[PDB]
With several copies, the nearest count.
Chain A
Amino acid sequence: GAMGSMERASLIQKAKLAEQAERYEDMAAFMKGAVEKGEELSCEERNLLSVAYKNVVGGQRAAWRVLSSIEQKSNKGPEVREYREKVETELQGVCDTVLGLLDSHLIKEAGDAESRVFYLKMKGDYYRYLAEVATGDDKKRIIDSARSAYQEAMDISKKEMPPTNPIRLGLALNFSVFHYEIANSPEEAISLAKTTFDEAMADLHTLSEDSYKDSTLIMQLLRDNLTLWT
């Protein structure tokens, strides 16, 4: 409860209607209730969970950046810092909710590569969003948790997936962004995007038309970042 009495299938169905109505807080709440039924998520359901929370935290991050900028310009009453702190605490709350679902329900030592990598990338992403608003020593611990999650995901992906696999590609892209934007390691970020891009390009010849489009769309994002960064 509030989703405890609803059938798993009905929560999934409603998550999909909430998506069509762009009601992403409802979608997240329905997917959280689904995960709490304790059965593993299918590939389509993992994507629903992630789209829902990506949109919820996407909004909070965008608002936080607005309010942060206004606060730095003003750095007078406490209202700007108060309201930035309120948004921040809410954003942290949603991060902690996702990390909680990942830790308590979803991350398994067992696992197919496609699920284990997907969730560990997620864990890295949500710690990264916590790192964006963190300061000082709390920050270094948070940064290390993100790094550790992305690293385990990378190790699995490189053992268990081909270098064009879109989940593997999206992971390298986000870990490269972690290096560049959070970890103060632009050379590592550049090297990771480069090697990822070039190892995927080398392998495109093995793909169908539709797999080629999936993989290349993400490669193009790698290239856009490399182009931005160099």
Chain B
Amino acid sequence: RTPSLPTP
């Protein structure tokens, strides 16, 4: 699964 933004 592709990573999304790890911060808000």
Give A residues with C-beta under 8 Å from B. Answer: 46-47, 49-51, 54, 65, 118, 125, 128, 170, 173-174, 177, 180-181, 218, 221, 224-225, 228-229
Contact = CB atoms under 8 A, between A and B. Distances in A.
A225 B7 contact: no
Q: Please report whether the interface of chain A is mostly helix, strand, loop or mixed according to DSSP.
A: helix
A225 B2 CA distance: 7
B2 A221 contact: no
Contacts of B4: 125, 128, 173-174, 177
A228 B3 CA distance: 10
A181 B5 CA distance: 14
Contacts of B1: 65, 181
A180 B5 contact: no
A223 to B, nearest CB: 12
B8 A50 contact: yes
A105 B5 CA distance: 24
A51 B2 CA distance: 20
B8 to A, nearest CB: 3
Q: How large is the interface on B (under 10, 10 to 19, 20 to 34, 35 or more residues)?
A: under 10
A170 B3 contact: no
Nearest to B8: A50
Contacts of B2: 177, 180-181, 225, 228-229
Given A125-B4, A181-B2, A224-B3, 15 more contacts: A47-B8, A50-B8, A51-B8, A54-B8, A170-B5, A173-B4, A173-B5, A174-B5, A177-B3, A177-B4, A180-B2, A181-B1, A221-B5, A221-B6, A228-B2
A225 B8 contact: no
Which of A51, A65, A221 counts the most B-chain CB atoms under 10 A from its CB? A221
23 contacts: A46-B8, A47-B8, A50-B8, A51-B8, A54-B8, A65-B1, A118-B8, A125-B4, A128-B4, A170-B5, A170-B7, A173-B4, A173-B5, A174-B4, A177-B3, A177-B4, A181-B1, A181-B2, A221-B3, A221-B5, A224-B3, A225-B3, A228-B2
User: Ordered nearest first, which 4 A-B pairs have the shortest CB separation?
Assistant: A50-B8, A170-B5, A47-B8, A177-B4
A221 B6 CA distance: 9
